[PDB]
Ligand binder design. Sequence first.
Ligand code: NI
Ligand code: NI
Lengths: 212, 220
Amino acid sequence: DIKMTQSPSSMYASLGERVTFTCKASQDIYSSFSWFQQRPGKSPKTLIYRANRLVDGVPSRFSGSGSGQDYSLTISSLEYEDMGVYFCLQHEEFPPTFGGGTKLELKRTDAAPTVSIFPPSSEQLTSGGASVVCFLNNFYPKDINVKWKIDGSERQNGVLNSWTDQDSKDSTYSMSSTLTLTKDEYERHNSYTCEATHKTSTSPIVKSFNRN
Amino acid sequence: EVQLVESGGGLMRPGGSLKLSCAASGFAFSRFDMSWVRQTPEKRLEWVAYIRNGADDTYYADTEKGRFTISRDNAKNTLYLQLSSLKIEDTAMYYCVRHSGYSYVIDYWGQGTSVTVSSASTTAPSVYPLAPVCGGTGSSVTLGCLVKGYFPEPVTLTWNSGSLSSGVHTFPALLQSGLYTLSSSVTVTSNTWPSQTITCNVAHPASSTKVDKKIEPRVP
Ligand code: NI
Ligand code: NI
């Protein structure tokens, strides 16, 4: 099949800014080319067809150009609803092939996380397990490190870290870190600590509790 | 008002079979060519199958004998995709798409139907409330819900039956030793909890599990 190479793979952009995605085909596709938008949590929507024609209802700030092997999508004045993943498609030859997608996200000012720690619930301890949970809320940018300490010693085995996508209201990220132990192991120690390191400060944010 | 609505997806063991349907409405179904397209868990989009007005003029991306069969019933305004000899890598969201004219250009997409090919058994989640640490001080309070040990995806989770949506963050499910774990946090002002009840609502349709878990302060 014809290969479609889309760039960049992701980018951050400010509101009102001009943004351009490119796509390169492995052979001439004679403008049998379309762009699609996939907003978070939804199915794709066709934006453009024939390289440069706008689908009805799509605002005029979108525009496509190109020919031969090289095609471009330009968003002239970025708006909040333009975030999501953009895909190119050639349909000159069967099977049609999609590009790998460009993820468009919102650039904003740096923000430190708000950190909360949760001991295992009494219901979980009845079952024989014990999860300690750390929530890191409302930070930017996305990169962040979490360190768990049990009675002062670092523990990395059994940690599960999950980030949200970019917040639709304030463009921050959040992440959940879950340390899963056996009940027997949880009861062998007393103090549990979640330490978050983020570029907004050289000192980590620390939350702890003691089993008492 | 063009509408394409897929169904038929679910969990299936490798080697099994699954028939997907696409109910169309709002246009003269019998005059448009149709395709199926799938999106993998890595979010890659890929063509599957294509059919014209005729029942024999079908085209497949992979034509390995008897693995994909696209068909259509013009009297029922329905499109079908028969999946056979399923492989793990057939796991994806399958989309019904309508061709605009005689070419391969697409206009409308369906909502998708999720297919999971796995050897694992369906498993109900355990739902655990996350209350703050014994103590209690600040302008707001953060509560949590931990949903652990289920299969397959998805679970849905709301707070107070949807009426509490501000300050909510739900963290995507992650596979941990064959089973999924998900969590959610909600932040509200300190004067509203625990004076007002806050409840985690968790639904896992594949196991029919529905749990409404009240968050209550820790004791002592
Ligand atoms: Ni190829
Ligand atoms: Ni938020």
